[model samples]
Target: TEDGETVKVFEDLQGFETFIANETEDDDFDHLHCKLNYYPPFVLHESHEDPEKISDAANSHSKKFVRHLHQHIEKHLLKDIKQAVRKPELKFHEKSKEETFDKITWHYGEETEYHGRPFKIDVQVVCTHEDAMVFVDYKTHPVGAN
Candidate 1:
């Protein structure tokens, strides 16, 4: 909860304040990192380009994508997640569900300064379901293509 950091954990339908209470950084506990670099989904099909004249359509599409996710993140994501992680962990008890919209971009220009330039970026729902919002932009090609 401090500058993009997680200060809570949730599972089932509630929060585990005790679990999150003593931890500061994600690494404070034994956690497996998913890796944290990402290229927006816009590139999946034709993230063909960006900035200036190369991205009017891309920007427009990215705008729409962001909007849609913000609209349904809670339903499509949080709902399913809370239902899942709540299952008791091997050694840890799953906390109730937690919803975080830390830096979600519901629309264009929600965030600026990409690669040292001013421009719109991909839409992101960016919620945290665990001590680890643990959002690693799932590399398109981890075999040397992140």
Candidate 2:
């Protein structure tokens, strides 16, 4: 890397995490470490790639959704055992990397209107085990915030 330091690159988040987990158990770095870096090369860093699969999973709810909470779940989704949800249909916008939701009149009645806001679904897990469609969003405040 730049200046004699060693730089590691993982294929993806799971790859990176797995490496860290193993290393920690072996020689370990507390790596057990609190903060992990999502290097652009290793992260779901593509403008078109939802590195974490947020966009695809959210769109899934418009039809068949994926619970991308952990790697196993992610692995399952990759198998393409389900169909992709159609566009402008899915509504699981807690952090669905696409465009923001817009404001609209309360359909069916009232003079009241609903406001639109950007909901960044940081990290979540939506399930349907014969009875479930839930969201658990994880938020991360960067290094500096005023």
Candidate 3:
């Protein structure tokens, strides 16, 4: 069942916990779900003596920030699931690609009261493979919004 075959259903939270516990066999297994929601590709705005240095820094920072944010969301979501399930093991996936311009666009006065106000937003959703249930963990930076 864990092999991504037919979907499994739990009567309640306890049922789900039992499923996970039995499936994991006390070993740590993480099920991660992530998306590249609303992210822009890395653009080299400044010329660097060593481009690798800048690239490395940007990559590391992005990974760390995303990991932390995902962790936070996982913890928060787990709080609700844990109430019904016991020792629920959780995992999150990191997005494989960055947001692209083609995927995003600016909205002009789509909603009233905000008429003439231009806004741009991109969305990515994360979910578990087993359940295919997803949640959107907003991860937009001020610079990204602008």
Candidate 4:
């Protein structure tokens, strides 16, 4: 008999992984929920008062910024998961009942430089039982709107 076996429940990112492994089984819970908040990426030395300039940034500058964001998130997630595997003490997941939730903040300064003056872009990721949300904590420059 497996009398010494220990059973535990994960109410965080670990639960998410568990759900992925046992998609059809009721090992952890019913469904996994995650939310994402996104903000339009912008740049410095850009004209933003006019309709044309705003559209131009959206079409061109924003395009690459979004692309970079995807790659950035993917890279960090993978790295974090790997670390979590080795060290369970590392904080990457949280919970509310059977629902697992957590928030992740990423800084996008070095990657998104503006005219040799790099600015900070704070992007946050949150997850919960029902769903998930993502939002960017953006800021304006001292000279004008950022």
Estimate, for each residue in 95-118, the C-alpha lDDT of model 2 and write its tens digit. 233222321111111111112212
**Best of the two (3, 4) by lDDT:** 4
TM values, all candidates:
0.25, 0.22, 0.22, 0.23
Q: What is the Å distance of residue 93 in model 2 from its true position?
A: 27
lDDT tens readout by residue for model 3, 1-146: 13232335333334444554443354322321122222211222322434333343332234443454355434543443333223334222222333342221111111111122322222243422222123332111121233
Residue 2 error for model 3, in Å? 14
Candidate 4 displacement at residue 102 in angstroms: 28
Q: Predicted candidate 3: what Cα RMSD to the true structure?
A: 19.9
Give each model's whole-structure lDDT: 0.28, 0.28, 0.30, 0.32
Candidate 1 residues 1-146, lDDT tens each? 12234322233122222232232133222221112222233333343443232333333134454444344443433333223223121121222223334333221112222123332212122423111122322011111222
Candidate 3 runs further than 4 Å off: 1-5, 26-77, 80-146
Off by over 4 Å in 1: 1-63, 87-146
Where's the lowest-lDDT run of ten residues in candidate 2?
104-113
Among the numbered candidates, top lDDT falls to 4
Q: Give the per-residue Cα lDDT of candidate 3 at 76.
A: 46
